[PDB]
Design a protein around this ligand. Sequence first.
Ligand SMILES: N[C@@H](CC(=O)O)C(=O)O
Lengths: 299, 318, 303
Amino acid sequence: SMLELPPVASLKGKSITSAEQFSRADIYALIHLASAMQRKIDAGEVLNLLQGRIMTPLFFEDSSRTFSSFCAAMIRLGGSVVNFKVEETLADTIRTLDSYSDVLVMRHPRQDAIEEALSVAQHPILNAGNGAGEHPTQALLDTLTIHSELGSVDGITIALIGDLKMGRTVHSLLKLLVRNFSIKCVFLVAPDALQMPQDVLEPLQHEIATKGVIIHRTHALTDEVMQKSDVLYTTRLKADITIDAARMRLAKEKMIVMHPLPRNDELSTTVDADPRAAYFRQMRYGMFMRMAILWSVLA
Amino acid sequence: LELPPVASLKGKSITSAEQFSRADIYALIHLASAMQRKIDAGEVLNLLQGRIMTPLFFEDSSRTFSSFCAAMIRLGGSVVNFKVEETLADTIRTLDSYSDVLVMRHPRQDAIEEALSVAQHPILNAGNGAGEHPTQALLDTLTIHSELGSVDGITIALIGDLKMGRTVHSLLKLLVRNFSIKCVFLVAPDALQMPQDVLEPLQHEIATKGVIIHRTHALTDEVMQKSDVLYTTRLQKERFMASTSDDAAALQSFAAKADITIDAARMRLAKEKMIVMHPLPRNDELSTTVDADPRAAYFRQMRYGMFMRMAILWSVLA
Amino acid sequence: SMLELPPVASLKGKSITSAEQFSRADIYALIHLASAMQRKIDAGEVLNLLQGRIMTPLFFEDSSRTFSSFCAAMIRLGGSVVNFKVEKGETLADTIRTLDSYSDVLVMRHPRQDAIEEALSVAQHPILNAGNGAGEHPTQALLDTLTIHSELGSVDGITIALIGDLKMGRTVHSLLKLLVRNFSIKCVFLVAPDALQMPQDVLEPLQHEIATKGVIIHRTHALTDEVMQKSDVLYTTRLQKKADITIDAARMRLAKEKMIVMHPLPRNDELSTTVDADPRAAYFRQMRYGMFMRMAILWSVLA
Ligand SMILES: N[C@@H](CC(=O)O)C(=O)O
């Protein structure tokens, strides 16, 4: 194609650990790069941008969808993957990975493992999940999905639904959206015990007030949440937060249902055939955003 | 090119020996052989650069997935691993988001049809319970062709656990439907005999082509003297609930109710021009004493397997 | 290119099972090839030397470090890896024949010492021994020697301590053989209790080399001041899996200014993290030298 693939220069050589490290301009640059990669790959073009570069996982907890998304992205850039399964100190493991790798993709059940990893690593680390902390590449792919499906991120009303306390995806997404866009409204839908934590909401208070972002907490998918949301973004944790075909009769015509996956019965299979079910297409947007990120980091 | 893809396989899932015609089988054979000549001469092929194969192995066999991996790599393709360690449909959709071809192995026989109804890219059935193993039948037939020269006219013994042997299920279908086989010996204890749901759909073609079918429970002198191909198999213990008395009887019958071991002594009765085959892996049914015999084709079979898998992958994805 | 990256011709098509199979010339040829590989990879050059060739690991015991090192090395030569995992009653020989039907090279690690010889009797393609019980680890010995050469500038004339479980340690078995057979080693310290000492079946065959080059060998139970003061290389290993063998910042005050501490890894408390910031701590650099030595080996085997 006549499209080019300029890497996002601000990401060069950088570790990706938080949604906080991206500007609005970084995000759009990554969206447009991901979209151009999508067009080339879908036309059958073979990219050889990262020939001879190695990605290695550091997955102290398992996620085949995550791991495989990253490997596929690296491979479609012409890069290669070396496996390193854990089942020795984290520091020694990291130094070992650094001896042969160009980029590390780390997932860890401890939230602070990223900081320790960063202090010894010589190559960029991409955070693929640090306990209940963040999942910054998921936030970026989630935002690509919103943009590609609805045409706009500014002005949206989004429901964040499920285990908001322990959901690292909703943490990164709220941060990324509120910091960089003019979000109209965020419904935070969860049982009181699993509400969105204060250590996510407080740093955002200034931006929320300045931009006039409306935050409403509920413990249920009310008819209001269903009638006003452009995006229903749901996660694993009962009948009052479930999205099924019956509940979808209240939804706008123009909206999407998203879910980072895996799901349980908070997202019924009765929704899967609805055009508005975006949660499978989300994963494909995932591959392309990850391609954009990797190329930008390693260019 | 030297390597024209088999046009009828373009974009299609490979699930049963029944989907292939005689012409398809010969086109794949000649493509596999052409690939073998190029690979053995040291040529690098770049036909599937940028394409991804991924597993969907719900019973595992790093053994079988690795043979498909090697084929993909020798076509210039790439591999992404997926560990099943969530619904079957959601898993498929996940692999579909990033892959070009899925290679699926599953303990349930009906999981393939479920997969097919949600999958967007081709699925290669690498084994569905005691159902089928279609690519094994293709590579087996390539082996017969390359080693003996002709498939029509052969006398073939299918030996061992024919009840649970997905290999012999696929192979019997592929041979009877597409070739004129002289005689099939079904050599097994009664408890592990070839199932009715394989034999009955083939009854019309068996009759119409005048294929001789004989059941035995032993490698008798007649079987040893007449067979061009002795195709033997492992007892599928994984398919048997050891604790139940039915399954313990089926288990025991392999040694207790049949005389079916191939060793060097038994091979003194074989023809000069024949081959011994086994899909592998094996246990004691096929003695290591046979391995030195020039008629022992079961290692060469795996090499033919690589090239047949390359022929199939290139044809599916071209 | 035969100018920049000439393969070591002696290794063409050959399985690598023991440190004993290499000459001094082979080792320097591998060292110079490994350094040239390093220069190109570090400058960002992409190698296409082994495009279309397949390395298959066959690891009957785990080692993410040894496994990933070989995989990285194959990939950086442009080669490919088939990710076979061990874990129906299939034998070792049949597993080997299976991998052999589609591979160009096998990399085998196994808890039984004799498994390598059984594999070699059936394999048609070269097998690289990545560790055979308490026998040998020949590619570790090679990368260890590259590490010494590169860090200190010379292998001839060094004083080296081999520390830890010398009885069961496959890395120290291969290293001692490779060094004494092919270099004029000044002095070897074998630092271990008698129960875990260097085996007699490693020392006895080196008798001729020890006499002919006048190599000094002393046993100690502990890491004495003398060992610390005279050693150019301190090569340590896990004592189990730790009485008076620990290297820490305090012990290092006794070391020469110019020397290196090495460890094939993983480590327990025999090598304190307090040493990690020292310029003499070469045990992380050692792993990177490993990749490049494995590149020189793979290229030489398969060219
Ligand atoms: N490997 C073949 C035969 C066997 O396992 O015995 C199969 O997967 O069906």
